[PDB]
Design a protein around this ligand. Sequence first.
Ligand SMILES: CCCCCCCC(=O)O
Length: 178
Amino acid sequence: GMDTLLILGDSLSAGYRMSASAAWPALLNDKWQSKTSVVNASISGDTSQQGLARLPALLKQHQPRWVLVELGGNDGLRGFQPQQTEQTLRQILQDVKAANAEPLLMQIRLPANYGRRYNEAFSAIYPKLAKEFDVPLLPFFLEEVKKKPQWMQDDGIHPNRDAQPFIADWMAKQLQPL
Ligand SMILES: CCCCCCCC(=O)O
């Protein structure tokens, strides 16, 4: 049958200041045609806690086979304690499993700030949780996209619309084994 992949994300999945149909998860939905449905449930600015709050209703509504979790970056951009982001993501993963869905956890990393300690503590939560839950750990695309000015909005922070087909094709390759 035609299964649903739910994306629980922030602007990296929603697409910042663009139509939903322009964002890579919609392009991926188009690529996959009727073989697999992609539901983008991503909102710019969401923290992991905000994604957690939205998740139960989405699980009930969409009954997805897999949930790609792409969250925590805002927590880290705001200097939130990594243990709290870890715990929130842990709860997300528990909820997804208890809904009989398979979680897929995207690694997130932060831009430079001061020293390496905070950023390393933040990035470490993702392989830890993927091992703990024994779930797929998907690679993070944002640093590579940021190397292409032609793929970035004027802020140098958010990918633009032209980035999205490239991200879609890359994510398709990463998700094909599903
Ligand atoms: C650098 C960590 C990844 C940031 C993604 C979240 C951006 C946003 O939703 O506005």
